[PDB]
Structure formats: C-alpha cells, structure tokens
Symmetry: C3
Amino acid sequence: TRDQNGTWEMESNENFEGYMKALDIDFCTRKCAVRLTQTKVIDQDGDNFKDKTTSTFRNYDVDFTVGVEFDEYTKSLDNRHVKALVTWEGDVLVCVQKGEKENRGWKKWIEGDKLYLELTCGDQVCRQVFKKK
Amino acid sequence: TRDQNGTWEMESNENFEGYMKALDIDFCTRKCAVRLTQTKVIDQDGDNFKDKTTSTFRNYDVDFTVGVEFDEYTKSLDNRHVKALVTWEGDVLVCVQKGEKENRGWKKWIEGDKLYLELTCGDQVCRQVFKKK
Amino acid sequence: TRDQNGTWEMESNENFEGYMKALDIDFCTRKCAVRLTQTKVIDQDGDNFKDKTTSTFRNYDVDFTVGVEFDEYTKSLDNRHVKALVTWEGDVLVCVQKGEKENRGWKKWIEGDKLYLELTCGDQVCRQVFKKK
C-alpha cells in the first residue's frame, strides 16, 4: 500500500555502518549511531508527506524461568550468542552465560530498597547498584 | 525579566564544539554531544535556583510532495545539500538525492504492518525494517 | 528477598569500562556509554522473569543562591571542580566558575519567550537559545 501514515519503530538495521562510512560520517558517530533505534512518524496526505525521525535508546528485553536454560543474544552489549542458565543461591539470583567468553555471568540480589548487580566476564567485574522507584 | 522559571527546550547551539575543545573534552565525547539537544528545567524562588539539564535526541523533519524536486539538507546524517526527487514505482516510494555523492537515494514501502527502508550511497546499501506502533 | 519486582534506577556503576573492554566493546561506544544511566524494569511471578533494561541520558542538577559562592562539579561537561559565584547584572544572570580553566563562566537571560545562554571558556564562546515549553 501507498498509505504510509503512522508511527514506525525500528526493528532491524543492517549495514547502517557501511552506509554511514560512504557518507564520510566520522568514526565515533558511526559506532554510537549503529546501536540506537529510531522512530519515524509519517504524516501523509495523498502525495504530500510530513516526516519526522528521531533516534532512541533500544529497550533490550530478556525473559527466563529460573532453572530453565535459554538462548540469549546480548544485543545490549557485544551481541554474542550465549546459553544462559539462571539459578537461585539462597536469595542471590545467579546466571552463567556459556559461550565464547570464559567465566561470563552475573549475580543479582535485593537488599533493603536496593538492587545489586555484579557483572563478570573473565577477570573483570562490574558492580552496579539500583534504587527502587 | 529576572524570572527564569519554566521548562526550556534548545532551539540553537553555536560553537558548542569550540567550547568543548577549550574544556579538553575528548573527540569522541564531543561528536556524540554536539548533535543532541537539551532541556533545562529552572525552579526559581527569588534568588534561589534549582536547575536541571538533560540531553535529548534531536527530531529531524522533512516535508516533500511526490514528483516535486526539493532542496534537502541531510541534517540527520552527513548534513549535505542534495537535490531530492521522490517518485512512486507502483507502491514503492523512490527517492533520488542528487548531489556530491553518486548513486545516492532510498526506497521505502509498506508490506503488512511493517515499513521497509533501503538506504543507498554508492555501493553501500543499508536495509531497515520498522513495525507499526 | 527473592522478590525483585519493580522499576530500578541506576545509582552507581563501578568498572563498567573494564567489563565492556573484556567484551571487546569498541573505544567510542565505551566512552559515550559510561555517561549514561539506566532503568531496569523487572516483572516477576515466582521463578518467571520478564526484564527490560533501557539506557537514558543523565539529569544534571545544580542548586545555588545568587551571591553565595559554592563548589560546583561540572559533571555534564568536563567533570572539573570549580568555585562558582552567580550574580545579577541588571536582568542578566552571570556566573564565574573559578578553577583550573581561565576566563570560565556563563551568562543567562530571558528576553520575550526565550532563554539565552552564553557559555565561555578561555577564548571560546558558545551561544545557545531555548524556547519556553
């Protein structure tokens, strides 16, 4: 159909970087842009168009059941394939991400009004704290 | 007026790059920052101020009529001047962006609840898919 | 507690950079990513989890009283420490940021429905305009 009216949210983006490089867009702009998603609003009246495009941060969703392994594609980071398995150790939620990187996984737990997250890959550990809203 | 209360949205930004260089901000941080807009919330009571600043992604508008050539400044990408012409090929919306780059243009079409966009410059082709919201 | 339900806003992040490096995340992405905060939404029923994580731009806050010098940590830009003093010159709000950078400060004023901001560091001046929302 020719009727392009609506709000449209990006779901896939292939070779955005090669296209941007052809436009001589700088190295830093290319790498940051290729991770963003976009929203296009198209306002169309016959053959007349008013278009609006805006970058947005991608939402990165993951669903799982404790004790049931699942395939995870780490699009929020390095976009690798891992086989992820989440277990309870007491009240600590523990995830092992089996794949190319050794000793990769995370631990997540609630203490008080705070969520604690420890991210591990190899010999590097990232430690994060979140406040409840 | 001394009364600065309100929410303020950026509409122009001159020499942000030179100011950031003087502050010795790294090339990469500068290229991400220079393209964003800002919102300032000012909460003022007499001479007491609570100020809030937040970066936001810029919205890029383009208006055209099918079959009517128009001057396009590709602000969302490489900020070049092109002579753009949009035509229908059946239900495919086709754009030729005549200018410094050879074989530059795009194709856009609706199939089902999805919008398809193909961006071309020279021998580089980027393919994007959007879902209706 | 095992009950991780809620919306969680990041408040601290330690060695995110080392973790991203271990994942082979590119230099540019690492530099822009460290400046972001994130919100995690957790929808949990027993051992079933639906998790959503989204990056967002940080809010940068400043509180001050006209005529009272204060310590300012310029996190939104170069992350320097300055001694800031804000004064009125007529209806123009004037700030001197005393510190490592010479001739550093800003001037801010309302004219009509617009906020004007002049940012100065050394011999570089950035000029910004905001419209009221």
